[PDB]
Structure 1
Amino acid sequence: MFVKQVFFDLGARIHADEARALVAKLLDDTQPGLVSALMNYMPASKTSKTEFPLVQFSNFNQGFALLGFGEVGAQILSDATPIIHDAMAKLFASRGQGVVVQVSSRDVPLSCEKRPYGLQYTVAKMVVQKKHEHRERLANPETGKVFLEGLFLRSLERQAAAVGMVLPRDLVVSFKGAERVSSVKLRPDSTLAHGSLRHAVFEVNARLGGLWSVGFLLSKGFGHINTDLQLGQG
């Protein structure tokens, strides 16, 4: 269907996971249903859901951005945007002279069509490592290429099934090249880290017409980009 993208301009850049932790710390004392909505927690406990999370943080040059997938995620972002903006306004009016928080909002539709020619898509800061078995797959390129193939195809199928639209099942993807390999730490000052890929390029015969999220740690702000900017790039 359609997804929603809300940008919060603050005047200074804060990272997606840091903004996630900041709105977790700030709105915690009051309104527990709303933070249970935005961090996609279980209705009874603090543990997040194992399914596809509808609302995820993203990257903004002057602040942070929020993505609500589908009608439910769009409604959650719609009921949560003024409370988040008021919390940011009070937090940054408590200290200093005080800044003005600007907003932006977009409703990007989702579409996909199969074409008989390959198409190029570059994904920045995608997490692909979670276990030791994937590390054993990563050492050899032949058994790692098929792993990236299946990961990209399953991420596309999971997002298409989560948003509620049908995807053709004859898609042939291919993975060409990589630029860098780095690490991602969920919590600062922790020994544990997950391997991640920087500037991967992929080739799929079909075309995409919106924000598409691939890989792991999608909620934290990893492995997503707009295909609308990348088709006809400029």
Structure 2
Amino acid sequence: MFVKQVFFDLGARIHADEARALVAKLLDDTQPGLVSALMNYMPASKTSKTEFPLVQFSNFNQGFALLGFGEVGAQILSDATPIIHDAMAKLFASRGQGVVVQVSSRDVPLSCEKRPYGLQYTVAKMVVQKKHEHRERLANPETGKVFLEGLFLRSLERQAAAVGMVLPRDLVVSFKGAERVSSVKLRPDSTLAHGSLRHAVFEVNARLGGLWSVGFLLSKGFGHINTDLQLGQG
């Protein structure tokens, strides 16, 4: 259907995972149901859900941003916005002179159509390795290529299934190359790290008309970009 994008401006850039950690800490004391819905927690305990994250953070040049996929995530985002905005207002008025928190909103629709010609899409900060077997597949390009093709196709399929719209199942994908290889950290000052691709280029015969999320670590603002910008971006 549609995905709603909420932009939060504080005058300074904070990273999406750091904003996720910061957002949880300020509201930990009060209103726990709002935090449970925002982070996609299970309704009983603190453990997050296994399924597709409806609410995820993203990147914003002067702050961070929220993505709510579908009507449920849009409603969760709709009820979350004033409490979170007041939380940054009190947090940034507690210290310093004070800064005006500035909000923005968009309701981006989602669409997909199959075309008989290849189309190019580039994704930045792409996490691909999460067990040892995926590290073994990444050593040889032939057996890592088909793994990446299946990962991209299953990512598109699970996002189409979670948003509630039908995706044609005759899509063919192709992967050209990635600019860099870098690690990501789950928590700061932790020895554990996950391998990741940087500026990866993919080619799909079909076209996409909105925000699309691919791969793992979707709730940390990793590996989603606006396709509607990328039609004819060059």
Cα deviation 1:172-193 (Å, max 9, x = unaligned): 0000011000000010000000
Shift of 1:212: 0.2
Cα deviation 1:156-215 (Å, max 9, x = unaligned): 000000000000000000000110000000100000000010000000000000000001
**Corresponding residue for residue 139 of structure 1:** 139
Cα deviation 1:110-147 (Å, max 9, x = unaligned): 00000000000000001001000000000000000000
User: Please, what is the CA RMSD of the aligned residues?
Assistant: 0.5
Instruction: Measure, in 1, the Cα distance between the counterparts of 2:233 and 2:171.
Output: 23
Instruction: Measure, in 1, the Cα distance between the counterparts of 2:51 and 2:180.
Output: 29
Instruction: Measure, in 2, the Cα distance between the counterparts of 1:36 and 1:219.
Output: 13
SS at match of 2:225: strand
Instruction: Measure, in 2, the Cα distance between the counterparts of 1:18 and 1:181.
Output: 22
Instruction: Measure, in 2, the Cα distance between the counterparts of 1:194 and 1:186.
Output: 8
- Write the mapping of 1:92-171 to structure 2, written as runs, cut at 5 A: 92-171=92-171
SS at match of 1:199: strand
Provide TM-score, normalisation by structure 2: 0.99
Q: List runs of 5+ in structure 2 lacking aligned partners.
A: none
Instruction: Measure, in 2, the Cα distance between the counterparts of 1:183 and 1:57.
Output: 19
Provide TM-score, normalisation by structure 1: 0.99
SS at match of 1:178: strand
Cα deviation 1:29-52 (Å, max 9, x = unaligned): 000100001010000000000000
Instruction: Measure, in 2, the Cα distance between the counterparts of 1:7 and 1:232.
Output: 24
Q: List runs of 5+ in structure 1 lacking aligned partners.
A: none
Percent of pairs identical after alignment?
Answer: 100
Instruction: Measure, in 2, the Cα distance between the counterparts of 1:138 and 1:56.
Output: 27
Instruction: Measure, in 2, the Cα distance between the counterparts of 1:193 and 1:136.
Output: 16
Cα deviation 1:74-102 (Å, max 9, x = unaligned): 00000000000000000000000000000
Instruction: Measure, in 1, the Cα distance between the counterparts of 2:115 and 2:121.
Output: 15
Instruction: Measure, in 2, the Cα distance between the counterparts of 1:220 and 1:89.
Output: 23
Instruction: Measure, in 2, the Cα distance between the counterparts of 1:3 and 1:187.
Output: 28
Instruction: Measure, in 2, the Cα distance between the counterparts of 1:99 and 1:75.
Output: 28
Shift of 1:232: 1.7
Instruction: Measure, in 1, the Cα distance between the counterparts of 2:36 and 2:63.
Output: 22
Number of equivalences: 234
SS at match of 1:29: coil
- Write the mapping of 1:6-85 to structure 2, written as runs, cut at 5 A: 6-85=6-85
Instruction: Measure, in 1, the Cα distance between the counterparts of 2:207 and 2:178.
Output: 21
Shift of 1:62: 0.2
Instruction: Measure, in 2, the Cα distance between the counterparts of 1:135 and 1:220.
Output: 21
SS at match of 1:51: coil
SS at match of 1:18: helix
Instruction: Measure, in 1, the Cα distance between the counterparts of 2:126 and 2:107.
Output: 24
SS at match of 1:215: coil
Instruction: Measure, in 2, the Cα distance between the counterparts of 1:140 and 1:225.
Output: 28
